Amino acid sequence: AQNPNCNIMIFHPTKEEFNDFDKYIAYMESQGAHRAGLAKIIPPKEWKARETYDNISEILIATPLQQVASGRAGVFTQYHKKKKAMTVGEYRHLANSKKYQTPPHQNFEDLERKYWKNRIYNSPIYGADISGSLFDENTKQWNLGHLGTIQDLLEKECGVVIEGVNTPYLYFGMWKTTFAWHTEDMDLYSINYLHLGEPKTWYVVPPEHGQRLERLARELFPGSSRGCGAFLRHKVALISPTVLKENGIPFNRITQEAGEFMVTFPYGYHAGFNHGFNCAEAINFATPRWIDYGKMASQCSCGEARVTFSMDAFVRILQPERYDLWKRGQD
Numbered sequence: 001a002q003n004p005n006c007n008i009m010i011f012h013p014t015k016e017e018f019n020d021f022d023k024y025i026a027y028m029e030s031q032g033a034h035r036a037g038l039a040k041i042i043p044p045k046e047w048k049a050r051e052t053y054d055n056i057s058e059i060l061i062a063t064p065l066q067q068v069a070s071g072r073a074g075v076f077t078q079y080h081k082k083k084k085a086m087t088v089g090e091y092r093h094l095a096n097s098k099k100y101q102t103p104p105h106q107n108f109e110d111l112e113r114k115y116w117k118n119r120i121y122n123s124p125i126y127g128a129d130i131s132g133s134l135f136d137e138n139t140k141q142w143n144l145g146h147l148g149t150i151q152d153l154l155e156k157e158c159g160v161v162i163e164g165v166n167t168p169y170l171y172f173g174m175w176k177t178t179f180a181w182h183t184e185d186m187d188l189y190s191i192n193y194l195h196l197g198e199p200k201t202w203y204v205v206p207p208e209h210g211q212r213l214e215r216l217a218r219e220l221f222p223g224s225s226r227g228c229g230a231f232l233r234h235k236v237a238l239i240s241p242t243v244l245k246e247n248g249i250p251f252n253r254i255t256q257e258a259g260e261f262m263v264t265f266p267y268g269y270h271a272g273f274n275h276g277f278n279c280a281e282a283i284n285f286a287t288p289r290w291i292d293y294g295k296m297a298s299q300c301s302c303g304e305a306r307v308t309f310s311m312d313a314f315v316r317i318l319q320p321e322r323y324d325l326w327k328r329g330q331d
């Protein structure tokens with residue numbers, strides 16, 4: 001079995017190997033990359049996403065989200081308070097202000113220590129979940145707006161044509177902005193490109209051990225767990241590396257820098273934080289190997305998770321027994 005310890009693998013494809021996206025994902029899996037739940041891909045030196053980032057300041061962040069924490073430093077939830085619209089130039093100035101800017105630090109490990117010590121005492125503002133793309137239309141390799149769609153993959157594997165679309169999303173971050181522990185909708189893959197700015201630190205649980213994280217989460221968030229049998233779908237719970245280690249939960253960590261891709265694999269729980277002002281692009285995708293994960297994915301039906309239009313067909317076709325309950329939670 002390749003990668004039996006489930007380490008995060010880093011890949012350096014050549015420009016030739018960068019042509020065929022599906023083929024390279026399959027290659028990484030042949031080497032055991034998916035066992036970690038997360039892989040890093042460093043593009044060949046010849047590649048670029050676009051020419052420059054000098055002209056992005058007029059993008060609008062219609063609903064910036066202030067991420068307010070509750071709990072203790074290593075075990076907390078966050079809620080999202082909606083703020084007034086602002087441009088990317090305005091948001092960048094805010095991120096760099098004395099109130100929000102990254103503190104002085106020695107290295108990534110020192111900043112990680114500071115994050116986990118102090119995160120709860122601040123409420124950073126995240127420009128998350130903005131439909132759009134920063135890839136140039138002329139970029140032919142690993143362009144996240146030109147990937148094969150998940151509806152086409154389902155149709156190719158299973159023969160059923162379905163409605164829905166699959167487009168990317170932009171994320172503008174600042175120091176301490178946080179993504180809570182989650183797997184993707186329908187336990188899909190994700191791919192995330194860090195276009196510019198400061199790093200993003202990731203934590204990940206191997207897919208074969210995801211249920212260990214779920215059991216800990218039920219213990220640590222006992223009210224939330226009574227409320228919903230899949231409350232990590234709400235995407236609000238944080239647990240620190242120290243608490244994971246105290247409870248024997250297998251996990252790994254890595255820091256993504258500008259110009260690098262990360263891939264999350266089906267049922268790979270992940271969480272993390274941004275180091276300072278940055279911009280990432282991400283999208284979900286599928287492969288043949290996903291279909292069995294999609295069929296078995298948990299679902300939230302309590303009302304909280306509320307998701308896109310395109311998840312309806314995935315539940316309907318892959319999980320017909322669960323469909324009526326899930327759709328009620330949508331309504």
Ligand SMILES: O=C(O)CNC(=O)C(=O)O
Binds near residue numbers: 179192270
């Ligand atoms: O960057 C973020 O805030 C969150 N991203 C992801 O969870 C992802 O790419 O799968």
Ligand SMILES: [Mg+2]
Binds near residue numbers: 057058059
């Ligand atoms: Mg602009």
Ligand code: NI
Binds near residue numbers: 184
């Ligand atoms: Ni994700």
Ligand SMILES: [Zn+2]
Binds near residue numbers: 227233303
């Ligand atoms: Zn729920």
